[PDB]
Predict the structure.
Amino acid sequence: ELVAHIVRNYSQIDIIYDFLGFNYSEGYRSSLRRYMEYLQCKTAENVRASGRLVTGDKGEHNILFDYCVSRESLVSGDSCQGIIDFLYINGNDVTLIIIASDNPWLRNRQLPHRRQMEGIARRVCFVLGIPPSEVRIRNLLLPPTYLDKGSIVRLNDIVFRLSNEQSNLLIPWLTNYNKELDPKDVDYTALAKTTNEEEWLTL
Amino acid sequence: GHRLLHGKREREGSLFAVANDVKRDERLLRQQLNALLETPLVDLPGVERRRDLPADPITRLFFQHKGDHALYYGTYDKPLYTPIYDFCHRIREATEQRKRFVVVPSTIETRGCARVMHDHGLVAGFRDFHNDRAFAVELKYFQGDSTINVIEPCSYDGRTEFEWSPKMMRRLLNTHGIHNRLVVYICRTADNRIIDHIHAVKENIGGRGLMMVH
Amino acid sequence: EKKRIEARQMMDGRQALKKKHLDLLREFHERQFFFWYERASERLQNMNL
Amino acid sequence: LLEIGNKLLRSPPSPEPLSGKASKLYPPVGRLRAEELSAKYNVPMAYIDDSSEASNASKSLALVMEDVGLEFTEDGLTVVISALSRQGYGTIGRAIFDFASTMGLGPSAEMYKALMKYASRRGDVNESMALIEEMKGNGITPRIGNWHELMYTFYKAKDYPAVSQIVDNMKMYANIEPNEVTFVLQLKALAKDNSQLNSLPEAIQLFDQMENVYGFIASRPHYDAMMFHLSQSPRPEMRLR
Amino acid sequence: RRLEEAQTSPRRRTLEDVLKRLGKTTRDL
Amino acid sequence: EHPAIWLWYPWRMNPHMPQRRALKNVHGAVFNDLT
Amino acid sequence: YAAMELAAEARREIHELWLSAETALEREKRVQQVAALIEKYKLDPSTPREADVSRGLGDAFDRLLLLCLPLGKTDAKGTDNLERLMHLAGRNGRELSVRTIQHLFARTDSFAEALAVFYTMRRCHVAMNMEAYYSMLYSLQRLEEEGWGQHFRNEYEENGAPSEQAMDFIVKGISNALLPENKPWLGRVMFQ
Amino acid sequence: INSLLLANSNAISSNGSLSMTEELVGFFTLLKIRPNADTEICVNLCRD
């Protein structure tokens, strides 16, 4: 009876379950994509989705693009600095969402460089005709196996530009979704602090 | 396909820039390549990752975090006769010559033993202590005479090694029928942490013998 | 288990650093080759005589 | 000087050109933008005037600094910040520090020491270590003066063995040899340290070594620190010493 | 309560639709 | 043309070099420091 | 004796020509105006003796080389203009500076134009530094990236939304190149 | 360049561009290389 009630009511209990870090088979990447697409669908008003690319309107520049899978893409014996999971552009702002890999010796190759960020911004300007003046990229780092409540609220704040009350109204369970960063990993806490405290690289 | 790395040099990663010599140093060349590979970094000792930082706040204050520039740190180089034997020999020779600094190789045991000598007050200090090849010991004198009177390895020859038991550590603590905090015996425990006989006896453990000094 | 996993990951990171330093050296050897080309090229000019 | 610093803190000036005339907060004092002038000629934005509000404020500050007798540069700003910080005006000192650092007069390690003097008098180890970390973050390698200021922070905080730990750690890891002022501070701390049982013999040996091995010749502060320690022992050998 | 109340209150598969999903017409065949 | 500069204490200017030092050290470690 | 004053006059004329072609909107006027100088001062490599003003053009030579670059369309056998000056430089053994090469390739607009300039330089035996070579290749790299960005923008208006290739180009960038941006460590030894 | 032009012709769906056809024509005009009968065939196919 209780599981029947759970499935009936909590339509994204799977997203909550994967966000909490319970899923050891695939992690939370797919559920994160589904959550982000869900918010994109409720933030836009004419949304067309495809395999790896979801777009809203042609004027608002509301695009989600799941580039690849960082965990499998990252080989441990190669030297490349740019490997990102999702790329979301909202109006004139661009964000790169990367799930920090559990390997501290690969997190550094996972975080893209400043000049690569500049190139991404320049390509975005070329393709979508947005002037170089108001193109600005934010790099976003996330925990490897779960999400923090702070992480989710920040993801909503910068990727979708919706406040805390707006977020809790839009999704009921975020209000009491209580998760903290595991203190056993200080490397991720510091790296995420730095990356999220960075400013918008604007060119 | 996949090729495995055999030696420590291959495992640690080594360019082997020189033509055929496999045992060439490479420490400097890698250091300057990494240096020009960059200036938010200070000349304080670096640590490769944050969780490796010291527990003591004051030492954390001196230590900085650098991604891959924490490697190849150091200024001095490495100057049969296992490192503890050679360490004792160099310190004895320099003390008899009444010198100030003794450049001595930096291994886990040699470095821990030098730290224990500092704790017991036989060396004034160190220089370049975070080097992983060699570090300098700042010897201490008092009224023209040297603080260290005798320093000798447990393996008096360069060959034979020993394993001290807790009974051996208590033996050393009560050597010759006295209570012996005067001459300090150093032992490396089963946890790869170097202690003197006082702490070994307090903790009811022994270890591999390193040397004695007083 | 944790210690062994850290050792393996450190080894892989060392491999990546070697990759970067090799790529860095290639430039130095390219520049050094350039000096040889100038000197070698001129010495051959005089051989025409 | 406190007045101008308080103005800077309460209402920071603007960098927009042609701004110092329209504003009564920083009134005037009687195409190759300033940014690229400073970039290519290595001329700090403080030393170039575009009739901006910030340039107006910089002129006022230079007037005050020259009136008080010092010179408008890194050296004079160090003196100004140290003077403000020795009278508890830490916020004003930090305001001037940041203003100069942004206007182009770099944040020298000596300027950082002059900033740390405020926490030094108060005894705020946390604030002093925060300043050290700010240096390390901005890429300034802390120098012997900064290490003395941290030492004196702990000394006024009544954590005396921290001074000895700082000196030892500075020698071994920072690779900077001890200074005569280092010995002065370390003897001062040993004069009131009780963490160990060996403060007096340790100080005796330290004095003997700093004279013999290091080659230094004891001055009045060395003599005073040693004699103050030797005076509190009723042991006749130490009284004789 | 919000979840409970939000649970309470709230083509043809022929040949042509498949062909047009694929982007081809019968004539081009 | 350009804004006026109002103060030039001259000794301030008394005090790439890393580029040359690193390249020379690399050349020495490659060739000049070899048996 | 007249060759010296003629070289000075040609240098002054190139100085004033660099200013005249400072807002050279029409490509035709610029290309033929620069072509005129070649025959008026007989810069062809057939004049090895003192009569050549090329050896006396110490610095204005680079400005003249740069002036005749933009050849986007209606060449009218335009490339021979660049080729004559390039052959003069090759015979004189004048080494082009990194700054001159960077400025030269900056004035190009299209990937094919830059490629034609590169192959003219390779056909003639002109000298330069490894630094200049790397800057040239970076210029070609950027030209290709801009061309592909223009193509994808062009397609974007018709399709109403970016394509999967559009976004994957936004992220990846141009494919294999001799100076990638996912490898920002390489190039430091050369560039100063 | 004939093979590149044929690539363009066969790439109507995979990044097909008449401006890129113009670029490939500019390659022939500027690089000083004789065109060919197969070049004529490929320009015809790209035009179609």
Q: What stands out?
A: The beta strands of chain G are 95-96, 127-128. Residues 32 and 78 of chain G are 9 Å apart (CA to CA). The two ends of chain G are 42 Å apart (CA to CA). The longest strand of chain G covers residues 95-96.
